Amino acid sequence: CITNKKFVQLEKKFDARLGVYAIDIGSNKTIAYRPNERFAYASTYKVLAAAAVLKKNSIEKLNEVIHYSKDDLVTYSPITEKHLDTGMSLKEISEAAIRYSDNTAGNILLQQLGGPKGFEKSLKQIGDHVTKAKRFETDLNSAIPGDIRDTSTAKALATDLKAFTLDNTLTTDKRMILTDWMRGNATGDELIRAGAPIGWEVGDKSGAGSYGTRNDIAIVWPPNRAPIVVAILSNRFTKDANYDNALIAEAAKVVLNDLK
Ligand SMILES: *C(=O)N1C[C@H](NOS(=O)(=O)O)CC[C@H]1C(N)=O
């Protein structure tokens, strides 16, 4: 009950709705708050779409150069906008999507999987019947009340990230490529990483959307311990609401101190 009380008070403090699911791989202990309620996933899909692309493609296909036109570029494409001339491989596109949250990279990953519905199919293959994927960037970030397009739950996202990174669903080389892309990125510095003790390495994928949507999903490696998977999703109640990263950092501290 005590952990539940902290999450209730975070919702009051930040005027927000909060979804939490975390699993300690060593003890199987879990922490859950609104774990089955839907939130817009925003940019967090990019790590799952990248993992699905790695799973389904040979190293040869993943290194082939893709060319895209200036007309495929959507807003917030800091990496892909530089490479109209050289093109990028699916490996490079995956890294751009995960490290920098590049939206055109996200779109190319969704396209490689057969569009949003093909990405959803890839998730059903790993047992996720919850996530609903319908739109491309940047429309997928609208986070409209009552809309289930481009939504998932904290439990489903955490379970998906665990499936790709810790359940031995990718070969060692692809798995380590994926988790390295998740480590050390500025987009994650104020989120789960800000709630993790120093020395507990965090690999994450952040997200942000309308209605104050602010998300982070992560693997955490505590010293001398098995990993922890953590998904923390949040939104607010008016279209223009500004999120506060501290909500995610403070929720992550609750999770990581209690699974300690
Ligand atoms: C992902 O949610 N997005 C991509 C980009 N980076 O934000 S993130 O670091 O929180 O992922 C801008 C916000 C959002 C988007 N598509 O608008």
Tab-separated table of C-alpha atoms and ligand atoms in Angstrom:
chain	number	residue	atom	x	y	z
A	1	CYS	CA	0.000	0.000	0.000
A	2	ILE	CA	2.859	2.382	0.775
A	3	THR	CA	4.193	2.327	-2.792
A	4	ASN	CA	0.671	2.858	-4.138
A	5	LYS	CA	0.314	5.902	-1.863
A	6	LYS	CA	3.460	7.495	-3.299
A	7	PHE	CA	2.137	7.178	-6.857
A	8	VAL	CA	-1.227	8.641	-5.867
A	9	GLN	CA	0.581	11.624	-4.368
A	10	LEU	CA	2.766	12.066	-7.460
A	11	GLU	CA	-0.427	12.283	-9.536
A	12	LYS	CA	-1.738	15.004	-7.221
A	13	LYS	CA	1.606	16.841	-7.048
A	14	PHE	CA	2.101	17.021	-10.834
A	15	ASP	CA	-1.594	17.171	-11.880
A	16	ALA	CA	-1.130	14.082	-13.990
A	17	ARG	CA	-2.076	10.468	-14.679
A	18	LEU	CA	0.744	7.977	-14.128
A	19	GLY	CA	1.271	4.412	-15.306
A	20	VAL	CA	4.043	2.210	-13.889
A	21	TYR	CA	5.234	-1.344	-14.439
A	22	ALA	CA	8.596	-2.705	-13.336
A	23	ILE	CA	10.015	-6.244	-13.115
A	24	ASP	CA	13.141	-7.328	-11.259
A	25	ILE	CA	14.556	-10.164	-13.372
A	26	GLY	CA	16.372	-11.674	-10.379
A	27	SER	CA	13.498	-11.965	-7.908
A	28	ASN	CA	10.474	-11.715	-10.260
A	29	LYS	CA	9.135	-8.988	-7.962
A	30	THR	CA	6.975	-6.402	-9.706
A	31	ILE	CA	5.725	-2.909	-8.983
A	32	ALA	CA	2.548	-1.762	-10.714
A	33	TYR	CA	0.419	1.373	-10.831
A	34	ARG	CA	-2.400	1.696	-13.394
A	35	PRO	CA	-0.386	-0.971	-15.274
A	36	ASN	CA	-3.174	-1.828	-17.722
A	37	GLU	CA	-4.378	1.689	-18.506
A	38	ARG	CA	-3.709	3.060	-21.971
A	39	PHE	CA	-1.350	5.946	-22.720
A	40	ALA	CA	-0.074	7.292	-26.019
A	41	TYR	CA	3.355	5.709	-26.348
A	42	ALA	CA	4.889	8.592	-28.330
A	43	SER	CA	8.583	8.089	-29.176
A	44	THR	CA	8.963	4.987	-26.969
A	45	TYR	CA	7.883	2.763	-29.890
A	46	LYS	CA	11.155	3.538	-31.658
A	47	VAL	CA	13.197	1.078	-29.580
A	48	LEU	CA	10.602	-1.691	-30.085
A	49	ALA	CA	10.336	-1.003	-33.819
A	50	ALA	CA	14.136	-1.084	-34.078
A	51	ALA	CA	14.254	-4.401	-32.211
A	52	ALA	CA	11.624	-5.864	-34.536
A	53	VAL	CA	13.608	-4.708	-37.574
A	54	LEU	CA	16.764	-6.336	-36.179
A	55	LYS	CA	14.876	-9.579	-35.519
A	56	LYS	CA	13.430	-9.896	-39.030
A	57	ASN	CA	16.457	-8.917	-41.144
A	58	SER	CA	19.830	-10.447	-41.917
A	59	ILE	CA	23.026	-8.518	-41.249
A	60	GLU	CA	23.298	-8.022	-45.019
A	61	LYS	CA	19.857	-6.424	-45.274
A	62	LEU	CA	20.513	-4.298	-42.165
A	63	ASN	CA	23.661	-2.818	-43.738
A	64	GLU	CA	22.110	-2.058	-47.143
A	65	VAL	CA	21.845	1.672	-47.870
A	66	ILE	CA	18.328	3.121	-47.946
A	67	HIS	CA	17.749	6.342	-49.829
A	68	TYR	CA	14.878	8.645	-48.978
A	69	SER	CA	13.683	11.911	-50.431
A	70	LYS	CA	13.482	15.375	-48.912
A	71	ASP	CA	9.707	14.826	-48.979
A	72	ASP	CA	9.911	11.946	-46.494
A	73	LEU	CA	11.427	14.276	-43.888
A	74	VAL	CA	9.029	15.150	-41.096
A	75	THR	CA	9.541	17.558	-38.190
A	76	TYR	CA	12.384	16.705	-35.769
A	77	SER	CA	14.687	14.703	-38.025
A	78	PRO	CA	18.113	15.874	-36.787
A	79	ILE	CA	20.032	12.901	-38.222
A	80	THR	CA	18.075	11.804	-41.294
A	81	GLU	CA	18.007	15.367	-42.648
A	82	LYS	CA	21.816	15.253	-42.945
A	83	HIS	CA	21.916	12.103	-45.092
A	84	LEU	CA	19.678	12.765	-48.096
A	85	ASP	CA	22.723	12.289	-50.322
A	86	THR	CA	24.519	9.320	-48.754
A	87	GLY	CA	21.416	7.471	-47.538
A	88	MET	CA	21.403	5.421	-44.332
A	89	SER	CA	21.308	1.728	-43.474
A	90	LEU	CA	18.594	0.198	-41.303
A	91	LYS	CA	21.264	-0.141	-38.609
A	92	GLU	CA	22.037	3.592	-38.820
A	93	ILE	CA	18.322	4.478	-38.975
A	94	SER	CA	17.684	2.368	-35.863
A	95	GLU	CA	20.502	4.140	-33.992
A	96	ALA	CA	19.187	7.576	-34.985
A	97	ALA	CA	15.673	6.678	-33.851
A	98	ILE	CA	16.832	5.346	-30.480
A	99	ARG	CA	19.634	7.772	-29.608
A	100	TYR	CA	18.101	11.004	-30.925
A	101	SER	CA	14.396	10.154	-31.327
A	102	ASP	CA	14.581	11.049	-35.042
A	103	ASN	CA	11.030	11.080	-36.408
A	104	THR	CA	11.827	10.252	-40.033
A	105	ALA	CA	13.956	7.347	-38.791
A	106	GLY	CA	10.915	6.227	-36.798
A	107	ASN	CA	8.797	6.391	-39.962
A	108	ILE	CA	11.300	4.354	-41.983
A	109	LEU	CA	11.316	1.685	-39.255
A	110	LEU	CA	7.511	1.562	-39.291
A	111	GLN	CA	7.576	1.324	-43.102
A	112	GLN	CA	10.128	-1.523	-43.015
A	113	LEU	CA	7.755	-3.491	-40.766
A	114	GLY	CA	4.783	-2.964	-43.087
A	115	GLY	CA	3.506	0.296	-41.621
A	116	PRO	CA	1.932	0.782	-38.199
A	117	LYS	CA	-0.202	-2.327	-38.590
A	118	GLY	CA	2.866	-4.374	-39.505
A	119	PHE	CA	4.653	-3.045	-36.442
A	120	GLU	CA	1.665	-4.118	-34.340
A	121	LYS	CA	1.911	-7.559	-35.959
A	122	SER	CA	5.557	-7.784	-34.894
A	123	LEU	CA	4.468	-7.095	-31.313
A	124	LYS	CA	1.740	-9.742	-31.423
A	125	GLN	CA	4.481	-12.204	-32.415
A	126	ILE	CA	6.173	-11.616	-29.046
A	127	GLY	CA	2.851	-11.933	-27.221
A	128	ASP	CA	1.660	-8.302	-27.036
A	129	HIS	CA	-2.028	-8.153	-27.889
A	130	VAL	CA	-2.441	-4.782	-26.129
A	131	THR	CA	-0.460	-2.253	-28.172
A	132	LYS	CA	-2.440	-0.594	-30.982
A	133	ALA	CA	-0.419	1.092	-33.742
A	134	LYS	CA	-2.217	3.087	-36.414
A	135	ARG	CA	-0.391	6.249	-37.548
A	136	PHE	CA	2.973	7.569	-38.707
A	137	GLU	CA	4.987	10.484	-37.344
A	138	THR	CA	4.099	13.001	-36.340
A	139	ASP	CA	0.355	12.310	-36.135
A	140	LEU	CA	0.916	9.413	-33.727
A	141	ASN	CA	1.714	11.817	-30.849
A	142	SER	CA	-1.730	13.472	-30.610
A	143	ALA	CA	-2.644	11.643	-27.341
A	144	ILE	CA	-6.343	12.561	-27.653
A	145	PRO	CA	-8.573	11.637	-24.662
A	146	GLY	CA	-10.404	8.374	-25.324
A	147	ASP	CA	-8.386	7.557	-28.458
A	148	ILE	CA	-6.717	4.147	-28.521
A	149	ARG	CA	-4.681	4.747	-31.704
A	150	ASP	CA	-0.945	4.540	-31.012
A	151	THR	CA	-1.411	3.522	-27.366
A	152	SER	CA	-0.074	0.833	-25.084
A	153	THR	CA	0.155	0.154	-21.343
A	154	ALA	CA	3.066	0.285	-18.930
A	155	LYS	CA	2.837	-3.492	-18.457
A	156	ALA	CA	2.767	-4.206	-22.193
A	157	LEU	CA	5.677	-1.876	-23.021
A	158	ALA	CA	7.808	-3.157	-20.126
A	159	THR	CA	7.064	-6.754	-21.103
A	160	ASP	CA	7.903	-6.032	-24.752
A	161	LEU	CA	11.193	-4.346	-23.866
A	162	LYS	CA	12.078	-7.264	-21.604
A	163	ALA	CA	11.217	-9.704	-24.406
A	164	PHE	CA	13.625	-8.064	-26.860
A	165	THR	CA	16.482	-7.308	-24.411
A	166	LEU	CA	16.444	-9.876	-21.584
A	167	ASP	CA	14.337	-12.907	-22.661
A	168	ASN	CA	16.803	-14.118	-25.325
A	169	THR	CA	14.691	-13.300	-28.386
A	170	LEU	CA	17.565	-11.616	-30.275
A	171	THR	CA	21.003	-13.069	-30.960
A	172	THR	CA	23.836	-11.763	-28.791
A	173	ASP	CA	25.173	-9.435	-31.486
A	174	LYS	CA	21.792	-7.877	-32.259
A	175	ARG	CA	20.793	-7.717	-28.583
A	176	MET	CA	23.965	-5.882	-27.561
A	177	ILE	CA	23.689	-3.554	-30.546
A	178	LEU	CA	20.150	-2.724	-29.400
A	179	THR	CA	21.021	-2.090	-25.754
A	180	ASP	CA	24.129	-0.062	-26.611
A	181	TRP	CA	21.911	2.239	-28.676
A	182	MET	CA	19.773	2.713	-25.539
A	183	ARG	CA	22.711	3.735	-23.321
A	184	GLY	CA	24.178	7.169	-22.748
A	185	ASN	CA	21.717	9.385	-24.599
A	186	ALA	CA	20.886	12.931	-23.539
A	187	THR	CA	17.168	12.398	-24.220
A	188	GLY	CA	17.040	10.136	-21.159
A	189	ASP	CA	19.039	12.223	-18.681
A	190	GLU	CA	16.105	13.802	-16.796
A	191	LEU	CA	13.839	10.735	-16.786
A	192	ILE	CA	14.410	7.227	-15.347
A	193	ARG	CA	18.173	7.921	-15.228
A	194	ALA	CA	17.568	10.933	-12.982
A	195	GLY	CA	15.798	8.652	-10.494
A	196	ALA	CA	18.392	5.859	-10.608
A	197	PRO	CA	21.256	5.703	-8.070
A	198	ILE	CA	24.678	6.533	-9.459
A	199	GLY	CA	26.234	3.295	-10.647
A	200	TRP	CA	22.889	1.785	-11.747
A	201	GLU	CA	23.368	1.929	-15.496
A	202	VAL	CA	20.239	2.922	-17.428
A	203	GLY	CA	19.400	2.274	-21.070
A	204	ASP	CA	16.162	3.949	-22.073
A	205	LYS	CA	13.869	5.346	-24.732
A	206	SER	CA	12.028	8.579	-23.926
A	207	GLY	CA	8.819	9.944	-25.392
A	208	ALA	CA	6.707	13.084	-25.355
A	209	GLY	CA	3.364	13.989	-26.858
A	210	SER	CA	0.334	16.216	-26.670
A	211	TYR	CA	-1.852	16.470	-23.573
A	212	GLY	CA	1.359	16.642	-21.562
A	213	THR	CA	2.310	13.072	-22.472
A	214	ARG	CA	5.744	12.193	-21.037
A	215	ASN	CA	7.101	8.620	-21.064
A	216	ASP	CA	10.270	6.615	-20.468
A	217	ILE	CA	10.968	2.893	-20.758
A	218	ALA	CA	14.249	1.421	-19.635
A	219	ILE	CA	16.482	-1.428	-18.597
A	220	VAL	CA	18.428	-0.747	-15.380
A	221	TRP	CA	21.568	-2.676	-14.380
A	222	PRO	CA	22.234	-2.299	-10.618
A	223	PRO	CA	25.687	-3.289	-9.366
A	224	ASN	CA	26.004	-6.974	-8.459
A	225	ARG	CA	22.360	-7.621	-9.429
A	226	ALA	CA	20.113	-8.878	-12.198
A	227	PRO	CA	18.525	-6.212	-14.442
A	228	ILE	CA	15.262	-4.386	-13.822
A	229	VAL	CA	12.828	-3.418	-16.602
A	230	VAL	CA	10.832	-0.241	-15.934
A	231	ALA	CA	8.081	1.498	-17.930
A	232	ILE	CA	6.712	4.836	-16.713
A	233	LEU	CA	4.006	6.600	-18.727
A	234	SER	CA	2.214	9.835	-17.950
A	235	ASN	CA	-0.074	12.523	-19.303
A	236	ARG	CA	-2.056	15.561	-18.199
A	237	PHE	CA	-5.576	16.752	-18.867
A	238	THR	CA	-5.543	19.672	-21.329
A	239	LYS	CA	-4.119	19.735	-24.844
A	240	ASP	CA	-1.427	22.367	-24.142
A	241	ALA	CA	-0.385	21.051	-20.708
A	242	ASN	CA	3.382	21.177	-20.149
A	243	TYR	CA	4.988	18.043	-18.771
A	244	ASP	CA	7.576	17.983	-15.992
A	245	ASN	CA	10.427	15.492	-16.357
A	246	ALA	CA	10.633	15.353	-12.560
A	247	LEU	CA	7.390	13.335	-12.481
A	248	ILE	CA	9.151	10.482	-14.294
A	249	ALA	CA	12.388	10.841	-12.305
A	250	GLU	CA	10.464	10.822	-9.022
A	251	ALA	CA	8.353	7.832	-10.051
A	252	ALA	CA	11.530	5.998	-11.055
A	253	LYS	CA	13.085	6.641	-7.632
A	254	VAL	CA	9.990	5.075	-6.009
A	255	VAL	CA	10.365	2.014	-8.252
A	256	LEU	CA	14.115	1.542	-7.891
A	257	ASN	CA	14.217	2.167	-4.123
A	258	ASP	CA	11.381	-0.311	-3.519
A	259	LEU	CA	12.807	-3.033	-5.777
A	260	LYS	CA	16.122	-2.465	-3.958
B	1	LIG	C1	8.984	11.375	-29.348
B	1	LIG	O1	8.181	11.270	-28.427
B	1	LIG	N1	9.144	12.485	-29.915
B	1	LIG	C2	10.307	12.740	-30.771
B	1	LIG	C3	11.083	13.976	-30.290
B	1	LIG	N2	11.964	13.667	-29.126
B	1	LIG	O2	11.299	13.599	-27.955
B	1	LIG	S1	11.653	12.525	-26.916
B	1	LIG	O3	13.078	12.671	-26.550
B	1	LIG	O4	10.807	12.671	-25.709
B	1	LIG	O5	11.433	11.212	-27.539
B	1	LIG	C4	10.124	15.139	-30.033
B	1	LIG	C5	8.911	14.757	-29.191
B	1	LIG	C6	8.161	13.553	-29.750
B	1	LIG	C7	7.451	13.939	-31.020
B	1	LIG	N3	7.400	13.027	-31.986
B	1	LIG	O6	6.938	15.048	-31.112
